[PDB]
Design a protein around this nucleic acid. Structure first.
Lengths: 303, 84, 84, 57
DNA sequence: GCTTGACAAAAGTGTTAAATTGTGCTATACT
């Protein structure tokens, strides 16, 4: 019927461990890693080992991995008991659990049986950190680096504390002072904290229309402009006719009317085979010719 | 219409605007709406209807005083419907 | 102006990626397949980051000295021998 | 059911009920906070996070 | 109608110093 129900029915099958069992599995795991590394190093160093012993070490690995899997499957309950507290914060319960299990896996990889501390003591750190670190990396549709998620929560903490002391929402100055940062920074920070809204929401009454329907596509073509723009190209064509054959081409290349990419004086002078200063001189005269009332009066309307 | 008032909320002037907002101004425009053909009139008895036309006061059914009538209402209330 | 470069994916699929004639041609290209592809002609100079991802062995070596591990392995082996 | 069985919440009353949700869930936060927090090292200000209260109204 | 050398601004390019960003970690016990 329900999935989260199923996961619990299976982890509940595994038998919890006592302090003594944890160390034994811990030992078997470390023996499994060293045994596996020893076999790999001996081939690198051109060394051999007793046949029977070498085959014994290989089995140490099979027993080591069973220890690793067994250790995890026992403390899965601990992951859930920690994952309950972070529900409703923008992350599905299961996702919290799985991320907790990821943290749990690392704890097993770094746990130390020689310290004599109960396993749950050191695993809670990693499992806890694994979940929190996950939320900062996944809870927001627009991701924010953990350090920024870190400061945002710190600011909200100061805000909530300052809110409780003063009896009024602390201003950017009060909030910046207590946090030892510029008021403009807290403002820039307060902009980052905002989360997006759903276009598929229904702002119209009784589902008359979703919110997305009211969004303009400002990039869409404007029919009247595409026609005026087309008439402007045609009108410039005539204006180009009044200029010199070479003089018209210089204006085209200088602004890129023909190929759509402008050209510097040198490049323009390179196609006409003259100095880059000569092109500068020619262009200036074209503009003067273009500013003449006869040639220029027609194009003012196009602003 | 005409512009009545303007409310300017700046940032230099401390004020208090949502994060990022520098200046906030609102303009209030008023309009004097003459009763125009198409508007919806109605009495207190549920009778309602639009303004189909507005005749000059000259060509309007007027009493012997020369006192023109203001509005001409057809007999909406069919029998049984009443609207007494 | 268009340069036509072909990359080869690990699974065996090939892709054509048009580039500009003037610009440099990369040696590896993120392809439609979703995998990295090496170009066929032009030499690769592929400077692999060569960052070895941290493994469980690295986390164990930094707490157990090889001697402590050797002693543990003897305990385990002396234990398996006894079981026989 | 019957017509007379209608109660009719007044403005002040249905406002109070919304406060109940704010206070009750505020106590649900203080219960969790006091266990993890060190004893005598916490005060009403540290245990009380009125966010669900103000956000409720 | 064109070019020269000056000069400048503007555009790049290589070399460095912040800053930004991602990952690892925290050992009473806690299932």
């Amino acid at each position: 019927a329900d999935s989260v129900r199923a996961y619990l029915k299976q982890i509940g099958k595994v038998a919890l461990l006592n302090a003594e069992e944890e160390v034994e599995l811990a030992k078997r795991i470390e023996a499994g890693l060293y045994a596996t590394q020893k076999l790999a190093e001996l081939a690198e160093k051109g060394e051999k080992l007793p046949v029977q012993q070498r085959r014994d070490m290989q089995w140490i690995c099979r027993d080591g991995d069973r220890a690793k899997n067994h250790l995890l499957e026992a403390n899965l309950r601990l992951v859930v008991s920690l994952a309950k507290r972070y529900t409703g914060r923008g992350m599905a319960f299961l996702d919290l659990i799985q991320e907790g299990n990821l943290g749990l896996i690392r704890a097993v990889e770094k746990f130390d049986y020689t310290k004599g501390y109960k396993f749950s003591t050191y695993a809670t750190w990693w499992i806890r950190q694994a979940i929190t670190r996950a939320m900062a990396d996944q809870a927001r549709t627009i991701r924010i680096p953990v350090h920024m998620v870190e400061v945002i929560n710190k600011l909200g903490r100061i805000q909530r504390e300052l809110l409780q002391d003063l009896g009024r929402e602390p201003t950017p100055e009060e909030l910046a002072k207590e946090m030892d940062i510029t008021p403009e920074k807290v403002l820039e920070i307060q902009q980052y904290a905002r989360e997006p809204i759903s276009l598929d929401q229904t702002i119209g009454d009784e589902g008359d229309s979703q919110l997305g329907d009211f969004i303009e596509d400002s990039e869409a073509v404007v029919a009247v402009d595409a026609v005026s723009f087309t008439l402007l190209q045609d009108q410039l064509q005539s204006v180009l006719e009044t200029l010199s054959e070479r003089e018209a081409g210089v204006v085209r290349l200088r602004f890129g009317l023909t190929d759509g990419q402008p050209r510097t004086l040198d490049e323009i002078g390179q196609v006409y085979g003259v100095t880059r200063e000569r092109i500068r001189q020619i262009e200036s005269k074209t503009m003067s010719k273009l500013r003449h009332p006869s040639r220029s009066q027609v194009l003012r309307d196009y602003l | 219409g005409k512009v009545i008032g303007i409310r300017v909320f700046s940032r230099e002037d401390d004020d208090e605007l949502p994060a990022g907002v520098n200046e906030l101004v609102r303009v209030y425009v008023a309009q004097k709406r003459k009763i125009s053909d198409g508007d919806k009139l109605a009495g207190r008895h549920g009778n309602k209807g639009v303004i189909g036309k507005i005749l000059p006061v000259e060509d309007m059914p007027f009493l012997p005083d020369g006192t023109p009538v203001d509005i001409i209402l057809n007999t909406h209330g069919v029998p049984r419907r009443m609207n007494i | 102006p268009r340069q036509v470069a072909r990359y080869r994916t690990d699974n065996g699929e090939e892709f054509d990626v048009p580039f500009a004639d003037d610009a440099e041609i990369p040696g590896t290209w993120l392809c439609r397949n979703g995998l990295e592809g090496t170009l066929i002609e032009g030499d690769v100079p592929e400077p692999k980051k060569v960052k070895p991802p941290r493994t469980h062995w690295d986390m164990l070596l930094e707490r157990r000295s090889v001697e402590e591990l050797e002693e543990l392995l003897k305990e385990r082996l002396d234990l398996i021998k006894a079981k026989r | 059911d019957h017509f007379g069985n209608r109660r009719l919440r007044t403005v002040g009353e249905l406002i109070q009920n919304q406060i109940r949700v704010g206070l009750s869930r505020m106590e649900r936060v203080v219960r969790e906070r006091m266990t993890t927090q060190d004893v005598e090292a916490i005060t009403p200000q540290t245990l009380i996070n009125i966010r669900p209260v103000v956000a409720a109204i």
